[PDB]
Every structure is written in C-alpha cells, then in structure tokens.
Design a protein around this ligand. Sequence first.
Ligand code: PLP
Ligand code: PLP
Lengths: 396, 396
Amino acid sequence: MFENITAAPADPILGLADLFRADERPGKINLGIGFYKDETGKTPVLTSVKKAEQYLLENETTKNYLGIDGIPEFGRCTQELLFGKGSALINDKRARTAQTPGGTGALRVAADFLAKNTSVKRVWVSNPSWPNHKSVFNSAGLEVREYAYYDAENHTLDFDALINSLNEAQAGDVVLFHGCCHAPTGIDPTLEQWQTLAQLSVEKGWLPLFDFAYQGFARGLEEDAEGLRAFAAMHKELIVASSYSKNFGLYNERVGACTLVAADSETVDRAFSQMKAAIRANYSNPPAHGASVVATILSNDALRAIWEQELTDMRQRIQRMRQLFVNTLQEKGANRDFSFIIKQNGMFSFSGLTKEQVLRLREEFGVYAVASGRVNVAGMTPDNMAPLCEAIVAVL
Amino acid sequence: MFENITAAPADPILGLADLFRADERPGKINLGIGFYKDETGKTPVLTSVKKAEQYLLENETTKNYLGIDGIPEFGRCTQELLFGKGSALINDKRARTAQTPGGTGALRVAADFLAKNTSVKRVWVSNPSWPNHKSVFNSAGLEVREYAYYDAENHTLDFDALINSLNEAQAGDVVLFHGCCHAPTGIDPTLEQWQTLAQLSVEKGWLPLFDFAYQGFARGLEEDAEGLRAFAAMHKELIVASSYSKNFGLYNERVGACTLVAADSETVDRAFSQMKAAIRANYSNPPAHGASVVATILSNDALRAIWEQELTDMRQRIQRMRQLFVNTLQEKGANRDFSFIIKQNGMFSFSGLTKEQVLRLREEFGVYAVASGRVNVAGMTPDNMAPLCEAIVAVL
Ligand SMILES: *Cc1c(COP(=O)(O)O)cnc(C)c1O
Ligand SMILES: *Cc1c(COP(=O)(O)O)cnc(C)c1O
C-alpha cells in the first residue's frame, strides 16, 4: 500500500537548521530562522502570558470541549483588534469569528469552506509570498495564481505591475493580502495605495482574504490594521485569517482566528454554519490553552498594558537592528546601498545577495541565510553585528 | 458570494443541549452528553494533569514551534501504550507517530494522506458508528461504506452479518475498527474474533485503520490494546488514530496521535514524510500544551501511577452505574430484560427505547436521551438512579 510512496521534498529551511547545528565553527550566525529572538538570541515566553497561565492553572475547573468556534471572549477581542473598538461591522453584527489552530489553520478552514460552499476556483497570491500558502489552497482543491509585487531593482512595491497583473483576475476570484509586514519583503502598501486597492477590488468583484500575522510589528496595533479597515469599509464580504503566534510569542500553542464578514448578520450566520461544518470535519474543535491565555490578557487592563509594552519592545528591537545593520555595513565600507532596509517592516527582508554569495557566506563565514537572500533581522544582535557585516562586505 | 449559502444541518446533540438548558423542571437528567462526569455530575481536570501543568508553568522557557510531528517523547509514549513496551514494531522501527489536534484531527490527516498518496477510494465504517466519521473521510474525497455490526434483537455483535458484508470490500479498501468501547454500542469483538478478523483482513488485503479513543475504559490499558496488537502482529501496514481526550480528561486541549506502521523503517519514513506534508498543508504543527501534559505524566513514575489510578476510578464508576441501572430497573418492576447493559463497555449503549419513548421521556419526565435510544452511563449517579428508572418504567 505504502511500498511505492515517493518521499516528500526536503524543506529547505529545515535543511538549513541541520547544517547550522552540525557547524563546528563558534562565530556562526543564523538569519534563516522564521521567528523572533531577543538580544540574547532567545525566544522567551512573554511575562504577560506567564501571568495569564498562572491565572488559568488556578482557575480552570474542567477541560471540557469548547464550541466549534472556540472561546466567545477570544472572538470578540480579535474582532476589536481587527476592526476597531466601535466598528460598524461589530455593531451591525456582520462578522463571526472561529478560533483555529494557528494562522495556518485559519487559512485551511477558509480554503475548505470556500472550495465546498462557493464558486471560487482560484486564489491570487503575491510573488513572492509565504511558501506554505500554495499547499494549503491546493490541498483544498483551489488553483493558485500570482500577482507581481516586488521590484528587485529598486527594492520596493511595484504597484504598477501589481495592479496590471491583478486585472487578469476574474470576478469571484479570491485575492490574498498581507495585512502588514509583508513576508518576505517587509514592503507594505501605503494607506493611499490600500484605498485604491479596495476601490479597485470592489469594481472587479474580488473576494479579499487577509493574512494577518504581524499586527503590532510595523507601527502599532491600530496603525497596522488601517489597510484592512480601508477594505472593510467598502466591502460587504471578506475573510481574515489571524495569528497570535508572533505577537504573543505563542507559536506552539496554535492560536489564530478565521473571521468571516458578510453583508448582514442573517447571511454571515448562514455562511458561518458551513464554516463550522468544515471545522467539524477537520479537528472538531480548537485547543483552549493558547487562546484562553490571549483572551485573559486582552480582557484585563493590567495584563494587556504589560503585553502591549512587551510587543512595542519587540517592534523597537527589530527597528533598532535594521538601522544598526544598515550603518554597520556603511562603516565596514560597503560602497553599495542598503538603505532600503530601514524602509521595510517586520523581521524579514531580501538582502539583495545572490545564491552564490549566500552560499560562500555560509561555508566560508558560518553566516546562514536563505538562498533567496532573505534574512531575519531578529537574528541580529548588537554583538554579532560587526562580524556579520564584515562577512557581508567580504562577499560583495 | 455568500448570499446564497444554505445553512448547515442543525447538530441534534447540540439541539438537545439547548432544550435541556431551557427546561424549567428541577429533576431533569441529561444522558445525551458525550463525555465523562463523576458522581457530582462534573467533569473535573484530573489531579495528575493539574500537577503536570504546574510543572510546565515552572519549567517552560519558550513557546517556539514544535516539529511537524510534535513532541518526540509523546510519540514514544503513545507507541508503547499502543503496542506494548517491547513490541517488535518499536524495535524494528516500523512505526512513526505524529501528534495531532485530537483524535478527530488524526483521522483527518490519515484521510488526506490516504487520499493524496495512495490508491484508496473507500473507507468501511461500522453501522452504527461515531457520526462525524463520514464527514472527515468525505471531505478528504473518500467514499464511505458501512458494514453490519449491531444485532438490535439480541443486543450484540452480529459477527456473521459483519463478516458477510465485509466481503464486498475489495483489496486496497480501508476498514475502520474501534479499538475498544465501540461507540455507540459498547459491544467489542472478543479476542478470538479479533484474531479471525486480522487473519481474514490479511487474506483480502484490507488496510486497517483503528480509531482508539477509549483505551483504559473497558478492562485496562493493556487488555484494551489486545485487538490492535492481534492485527499488528499479522499486518505489515496499518494506521491508528488515538485520542487522549477521554482517558486524560483533556477534551479541549486537542491531544491525539496518528501512528503509521509500514513493513520496514525505510518505507515508514518515506510514507511518513508525506503524512507530514499533509499536516503542513493543514495546521502546520500541533498544540504543545495538552500533549506536553500527557508526555510528562506518562514518563514520570509517580505521576503515571496517580493517573492510572484516576482512570481505573472512572472505569469502575462506569462499571458501577451499568450494574446499578440494570437492577434499579429490575426493582421498579421492569418485566423486560436490560441485562445486556452489563455486558457492554464504555460510557455508551443503546437503551432499546423507541424514538417516541425517548420523546415522551423528555417532555413528560425531563430525562433527555438521543433519539436512537443512546444513553451515556456517566450521566447517571446513584442519586438520580431511582427517578430515572421510574421514568423508564413509566414509558415501557
Ligand atoms: C506566521 C504566518 C502564518 C501562520 O502562522 P501560525 O504560525 O500558523 O499562526 C501565516 N501567514 C504568514 C504571512 C505568517 O507569517
Ligand atoms: C472521542 C472520539 C473521537 C475523537 O475525539 P477527539 O475528541 O477529537 O480526540 C474519535 N472517535 C471516537 C469513537 C471517539 O469516541
């Protein structure tokens, strides 16, 4: 039965992880990680979550199943974070939120719901984009298409190419957008661009699907939601897959949400019932722990204040490293421009290095990066900054 | 887009839950729950898990992503629980285990892996069976077929009808088996029957898929694995979806495993890589909490001893209620036989009541049961036993 099953393709980032471990060299740096690290090169569990976990340990009386859509407070809290405390979408009750196993799980339930309950056949993804996108949509039976986004030459958002390729999308096609901190470029549309993208979206009849995994990492919680809120003000329907893996440092507890927005409550309720049928046929109901921690933090003034402070700390550290990187390279004698690094958001960016450069950088200096030249800024610390930049300068 | 989406069918057990809440009557009993309850009608978090959770709270240093297959110790521990501490399957390394979001999630990843990596098209399910089975398999694109199992007249396993209908299954067809405490009948094959079922299974070329959600609820941890171990000794390949929701009282933390067994390590590794690709396209990686709690209990002699004692306590309570039920009915004057209740395992059984009987039992006595006459024995307490049986006798 399984005797002729061909092996699945080796995951390139996992392959890197191994090579890094097996590296005897002491001064090795790893910039192809995919998560946050502080100045110590550690990914601690936030103090606000430790507090919330002590609270749960002392107050939980049962581990009985949650409803299909999860914890009610968690849903309410994510909707406000997404649309604003007094949004009409919330007052008119046009949105329903289902707690899912992480942001990836939210995308998959959207995919299954979309594929079995609507007429969608294609999903438009940016080029480049977070790698796992295709497989999620493709396993649900949807076809994936790509629209232009990155300008390799000038290192920016090729708005023209974006809009041009996106016009080949037909009405009823789903268009996926990164809410903020676009992965892997760190380049986000400006507000005016989001506004024209929403208006255009309405004319052509796209079904927007927002992947929101870094709210709080670009400018702030509310600032980062601006784009989505520009779309939500104009659209009668949309879907948003959110993740709390990075902003709450809860990676392994799988906490995210899938929010559906329809023209009215009657329609959102009917559509939501099918989204619940999709969940039931998958994992039945969601993991309480991680989501329970998020709901108690967000609903407690004291705990939320601490959390918000921890998040800005992370944001600022990343903002600090991008700046340090740029001018440390500018000190070692770069005779090349890397100033674009300061204009990008989140922990990712394309360094502009070639595969051969990243390869010798690894074998000759122990600096590990992804073949595409993608580097994670959270892998840089004010201590490894000098040896890093010297290696960069040596291969330029 | 969603404007013409038809609502999903109302879940009958959820509908019951509501009617029960809205019942003004004081002496109401609920036998259509689906989970365990102690003498107080409560579903507490076990003492061993509370201890393990205190341990984690004080020892966790990061919430970073687990590997696709989850915690390594958790996998090792479930394999021993399943196949025995020194099984050849473990020594020869023919099995790989992936931690999944609950037992339902294990079935879904098996479904997706099966549908996209093999030639399976049909899955044979017992009649009756746990309701959600069909949707899991059907959403993965597999067709579901049913084999006979229950003998309504004599209230037992219709082995003849079972084997007879199962011969229409072709080679390469998956046959689903409940490891123990068959839901919803509580009727399990005897060892000799499991042995003939395994031998037969080998001749016809079925791919056995075991759904193991109640290990420890029939006779004991090892006793309950006998059937699976009879099959594993003869088969070169099989799949087992396990759940820790009921035996660890961890319902909402979604903890289960999907174990793949192949002829050798080389083949199980190659097949397992595709199972991991399937997980990646779904929820990416599993929820650490619930599974972390299970792994620390199972690997600690002290904590495991307490847990094993808590599990037998649950088993015994259920065994006590079945006995009490039978002779309390036999005291109120039943002039009918319910002795079969004592011969069934787990918390479920068909009472033998008709839909009209269960209906008037509800509206006239406040005793809520499923339309099929299925009752949950854990909903009975030595305190509600008399009023329960009086209602039963009144509608007979
Ligand atoms: C992290 C991430 C996700 C999914 O994350 P989970 O870890 O599954 O919550 C989805 N999309 C993007 C762009 C991400 O960065
Ligand atoms: C409880 C159960 C499952 C799945 O349970 P989870 O709650 O998802 O772990 C699967 N099959 C049967 C027969 C069950 O009783």
